[PDB]
Amino acid sequence: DIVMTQAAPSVPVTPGESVSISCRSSKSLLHSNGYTYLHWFLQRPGQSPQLLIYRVSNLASGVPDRFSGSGSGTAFTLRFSRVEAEDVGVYYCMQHLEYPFTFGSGTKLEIKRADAAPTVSIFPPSSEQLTSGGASVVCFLNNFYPQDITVSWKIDGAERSSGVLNSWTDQDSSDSTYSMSSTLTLTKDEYERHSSYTCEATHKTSTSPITKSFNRGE
Amino acid sequence: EVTLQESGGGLVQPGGSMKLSCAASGFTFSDAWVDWVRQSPGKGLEWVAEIRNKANNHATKYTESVKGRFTISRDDSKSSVYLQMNSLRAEDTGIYYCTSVPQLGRGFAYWGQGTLVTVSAASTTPPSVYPLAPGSGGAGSMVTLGCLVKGYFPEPVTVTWNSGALSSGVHTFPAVLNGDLYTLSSSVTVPSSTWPSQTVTCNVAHPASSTQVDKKIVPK
Numbered sequence: 001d002i003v004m005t006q007a008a009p010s011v012p013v014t015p016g017e018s019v020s021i022s023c024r025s026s027k028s029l030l031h032s033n034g035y036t037y038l039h040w041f042l043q044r045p046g047q048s049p050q051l052l053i054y055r056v057s058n059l060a061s062g063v064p065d066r067f068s069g070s071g072s073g074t075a076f077t078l079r080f081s082r083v084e085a086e087d088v089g090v091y092y093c094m095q096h097l098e099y100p101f102t103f104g105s106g107t108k109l110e111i112k113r114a115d116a117a118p119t120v121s122i123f124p125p126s127s128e129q130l131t132s133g134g135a136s137v138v139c140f141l142n143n144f145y146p147q148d149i150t151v152s153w154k155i156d157g158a159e160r161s162s163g164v165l166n167s168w169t170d171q172d173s174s175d176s177t178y179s180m181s182s183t184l185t186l187t188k189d190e191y192e193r194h195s196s197y198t199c200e201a202t203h204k205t206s207t208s209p210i211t212k213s214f215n216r217g218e
Numbered sequence: 219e220v221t222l223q224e225s226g227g228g229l230v231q232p233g234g235s236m237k238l239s240c241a242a243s244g245f246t247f248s249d250a251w252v253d254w255v256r257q258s259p260g261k262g263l264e265w266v267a268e269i270r271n272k273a274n275n276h277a278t279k280y281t282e283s284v285k286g287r288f289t290i291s292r293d294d295s296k297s298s299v300y301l302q303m304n305s306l307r308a309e310d311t312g313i314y315y316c317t318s319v320p321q322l323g324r325g326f327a328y329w330g331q332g333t334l335v336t337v338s339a340a341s342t343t344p345p346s347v348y349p350l351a352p353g354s355g356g357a358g359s360m361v362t363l364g365c366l367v368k369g370y371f372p373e374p375v376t377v378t379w380n381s382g383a384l385s386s387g388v389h390t391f392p393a394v395l396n397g398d399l400y401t402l403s404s405s406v407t408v409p410s411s412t413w414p415s416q417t418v419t420c421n422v423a424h425p426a427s428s429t430q431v432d433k434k435i436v437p438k
């Protein structure tokens with residue numbers, strides 16, 4: 001099979017500036033008929049892929065003028081004249097010359113913006129869940145930047161690593177921030193063996209961790 | 219408006235069978251070649267199969283891993299393409315998309331919304347929906363509320379707030395699989411002047427189990 005390679009797993013860019021993404025094929029994509037069968041696709045978070053450029057440099061219907069493509073044989077480039085925050089997503093190249101048709105691994109465009117401290121909210125188990133014998137403590141760490149953050153759970157001061165479920169949103173297409181959800185899953189019995197539950201978040205925006213907590217006995 | 223709509227996806231038993239359908243509209247389906255492309259982690263986008271138009275003898279081509287197990291077909295009278303999948307394996311799990319190469323080319327110009335195929339022997343289980351309300355009084359500030367959707371299978375579940383009226387400050391997180399069951403959370407942030415004066419409800423739907431739950435977030 002023809003192997004499509006997209007070296008960069010991601011590429012950081014600031015809104016307003018130009019950027020380019022590369023793709024390489026293991027075999028020339030030039031067909032006997034003179035055409036080069038290489039296409040570019042965009043896949044926004046939670047959406048299906050969509051055609052951006054076909055046959056190296058032809059912009060598809062509805063694709064913004066800021067996109068352009070170049071290349072030949074085995075080296076191709078996708079270019080943005082002015083990147084916008086809404087451009088977040090994964091960009092893939094695909095060869096449409098031989099079967100099996102194959103795709104590159106994709107390059108995620110990451111938007112650079114100003115640092116933003118997370119808005120941290122902690123939630124005690126709901127009364128409904130408790131009646132059901134469960135006790136999940138939820139912590140939301142919303143709209144922060146950069147993307148990396150560390151979350152630690154403390155029960156009566158002691159750290160807890162097991163029973164923690166974490167999930168992260170893709171970069172926001174409007175404000176370019178990231179959000180995270182962390183859930184400490186305990187049984188009602190366990191929950192009642194302690195009183196202080198803390199969601200401790202460490203982010204580059206502060207030397208001291210952002211602490212949110214509550215007491216069960218309250 | 220060109221449109222491709224998949225259906226027939228969902229949970230399927232390993233070794234079982236499932237037939238995906240794709241209805242086309244908005245373009246000349248009979249002149250197009252139609253393809254199925256799937257997506258899974260640690261594989262990204264993967265071409266699956268293609269059926270050519272009548273002029274090109276309705277020829278079919280399949281990727282190596284599904285040859286002999288999958289069968290692609292089309293019914294031009296219904297502008298639909300199908301993917302009959304047999305002896306399904308774990309590796310077949312993922313989002314399946316219908317895409318076409320219209321009469322004048324342009325690679326895969328049109329794509330459907332995708333249908334999730336989950337190959338698993340686990341049973342369909344409805345979610346439990348819990349309201350997440352602040353543990354203290356707010357504040358002219360912003361307040362964050364949430365919804366915990368736990369213990370369901372398979373994906374997906376849809377979460378809205380106030381039937382869709384609240385979407386701007388919403389963050390619905392990717393589901394996380396625990397002991398054979400998914401747990402997902404969604405947060406919504408609104409002015410302290412909005413809640414609790416106005417009702418803020420989480421509407422959860424789990425198509426697989428036909429579950430629908432409305433949970434009102436009430437101050438604790």
Ligand SMILES: COC(=O)[C@H]1[C@@H](OC(=O)c2ccccc2)C[C@@H]2CC[C@H]1N2C
Pocket residue numbers: 031037096097098249250251271319320321322323324325
């Ligand atoms: C227009 O696209 C093509 O040329 C494709 C293909 O043709 C079609 O997909 C097609 C679609 C509609 C009408 C006619 C041909 C023939 C070969 C195999 C992939 C590619 N080409 C190299």
